[PDB]
Amino acid sequence: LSPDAYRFLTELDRQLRLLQAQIQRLLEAQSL
Amino acid sequence: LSPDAYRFLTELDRQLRLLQAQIQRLLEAQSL
Amino acid sequence: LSPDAYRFLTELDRQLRLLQAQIQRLLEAQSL
Amino acid sequence: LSPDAYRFLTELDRQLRLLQAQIQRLLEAQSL
Ligand SMILES: [Cl-]
Ligand SMILES: [Cl-]
Ligand SMILES: [Cl-]
Ligand SMILES: [Cl-]
Ligand SMILES: [Cl-]
Ligand SMILES: [Cl-]
Ligand SMILES: [Cl-]
Ligand SMILES: [Cl-]
Ligand SMILES: [Cl-]
Ligand SMILES: [Cl-]
Ligand SMILES: [Cl-]
Ligand SMILES: [Cl-]
Ligand code: NA
Ligand code: NA
């Protein structure tokens, strides 16, 4: 990867991780 | 959450986890 | 959907749309 | 972008577009 692509992917990864974490918390919070 | 919403979010979560993992592997694979 | 689930999904959608747009712009910007 | 990065991002984009579309359909399907 180019530096620029690396940087971009790093920022994408951080955002996706945050979203995934929000979904995971919501699922975990469910009374079954 | 409704069952339907729970199910939907579960499947979304699984897909996002797979994508995040692909990005993480690509980043990790970079010679600095 | 519950109001809460609707609200959550709305915010998720907005974030994903922003990410997708960033990727699309990067791809479009490529000299082939 | 490298060819490899371009290819990767293309596939990521396709997957995200599919997910976003699923969320959008669910939201649109809601009786208010
Ligand atoms: Cl550079
Ligand atoms: Cl550059
Ligand atoms: Cl950047
Ligand atoms: Cl049901
Ligand atoms: Cl139902
Ligand atoms: Cl489903
Ligand atoms: Cl409420
Ligand atoms: Cl509530
Ligand atoms: Cl919220
Ligand atoms: Cl190559
Ligand atoms: Cl290569
Ligand atoms: Cl590939
Ligand atoms: Na719900
Ligand atoms: Na690159």
Author numbering:
A (entry chain A), B (entry chain A), C (entry chain A), D (entry chain A): 1 to 32
List sentences quoted exactly from the publication behind this structure:
Here, we probe the mechanism of oligomerization of a peptide representing the CCD of the STIL protein, a tetrameric multi-domain protein that is over-expressed in several cancers and associated with metastatic spread. STIL tetramerization is mediated both by an intrinsically disordered domain (STIL400–700) and a structured CCD (STIL CCD718–749). The STIL protein plays a highly important role in mitosis by regulating centrosomal duplication. The CCD of STIL is necessary for its self-association.
Two-point mutations (A722L and Q729L) and a double mutant of these (A722L + Q729L) were designed. Both of these sites are predicted as d positions in the coiled-coil heptad repeats, and as leucine (Leu, L) predominates at these positions in natural coiled coils we changed the Ala (A) and Gln (Q) to that residue. AUC-SV experiments at 10 µM for these mutants all returned solution-phase molecular weights consistent with tetramers, and at 100 µM the data and fits were even more robust. A722L had a cooperative unfolding transition with a Tm of over 70 °C, and Q729L and the A722L + Q729L double mutant did not undergo thermal denaturation. CCD mutants bearing these two substitutions as well as the double mutant A722L + Q729L formed very stable anti-parallel tetramers, which could not be dissociated under any experimental conditions. We also solved a structure of Q729L to 1.66 Å resolution. This revealed an anti-parallel tetramer, which we describe as a dimer of dimers. The interaction between the monomers in the dimer is tighter than the interactions between the two dimers. Likewise, the packing in central portion of the tetrameric bundle is tighter than the ends. Aligning the Q729L dimer to the L736E dimer resulted in mean RMSD of 1.6 ± 0.5 Å (over an average of 58 Cα atoms), indicating that the dimeric and tetrameric states are more structurally related than the biological assembly of the previously determined structure of the STIL CCD (cyan).
